[PDB]
Amino acid sequence: AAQTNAPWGLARISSTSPGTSTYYYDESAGQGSCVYVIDTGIEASHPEFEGRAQMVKTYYYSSRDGNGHGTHCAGTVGSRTYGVAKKTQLFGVKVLDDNGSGQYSTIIAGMDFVASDKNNRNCPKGVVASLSLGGGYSSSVNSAAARLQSSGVMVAVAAGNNNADARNYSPASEPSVCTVGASDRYDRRSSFSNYGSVLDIFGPGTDILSTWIGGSTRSISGTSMATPHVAGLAAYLMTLGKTTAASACRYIADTANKGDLSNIPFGTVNLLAYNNYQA
């Protein structure tokens, strides 16, 4: 399948070169997979989600996304226009308040929730969790992400926006999950993107168009935007049967575009997420 005039990041993940604007992908499109977006919520009523999104858990007075961040990330995973995996099922877990903030204890509870809750959902092609959030190093936060991954969920986490080594941030620093840095449309490391040995992969993160609350759209930047590209890619590849939740981060790294990014510090992987789809 071909989506013309796609957001640059979608075009980038199906291309061997920057500078194109059509997204190419197998029509299976993540059907039969599920992606949890652990964030500020999801405006599931947005036409872009086509009934495929739902809120399943909140730790606050509403499950609504009063911020926009979670809706944007969910749109990059799986919205019809802005999403990588256009037929996946999206499940929102609201661990962040409407200011985008949240206590680590709530974030940990949300991860353990997903590990159990997947047993209440129909995801025959597999389960992914996208975590566009983080703070300072916490062994307890890392352990929760490790448990979620161990339970059979492909966990993708944002590297962080400090232009620093991600070793000092959580869950970015957990070795067993997929830690995602950000790139721009000219294949430069995004100026804010964290780096370091703990990164597994880069995805598009500067000037990413996606869904927003109020049935709208906007373009914003962050490793929060790169992470759902990778989460959606994992769901897409699992539906295709090319990999599994336990193996998807390694498979994505194996099949990535290699050596094409600029300003990658020595010792950080130079790997850009790529679906290797041949129309």
Swiss-Prot record:
Residues 7-279 form the Peptidase S8 domain. Its EC number is 3.4.21.64. Binds 2 calcium ions per subunit. Ca(2+) 1 binds at residues 175, 177, 200. Keywords: Calcium, Disulfide bond, Hydrolase, Metal-binding, Protease, Serine protease, Signal, Zymogen. One of its GO terms (cellular component) is extracellular region. It is an enzyme of class 3 (hydrolase). It comes from the Eukaryota. Its cofactor is Ca(2+). GO terms for molecular function: metal ion binding; serine-type endopeptidase activity. The keyword Cell inner membrane does not apply. Disulfide bonds join 34-123, 178-249. GO terms for biological process: proteolysis. The keyword Signal applies. Ca(2+) 2 binds at residues 16, 260. The active site is at residues 39, 69, 224. Hydrolyzes keratin at aromatic and hydrophobic residues. Belongs to the peptidase S8 family. This is Proteinase K. It comes from Parengyodontium album. The gene is PROK. The chain holds residues 106 to 384 of 384 of the full protein.
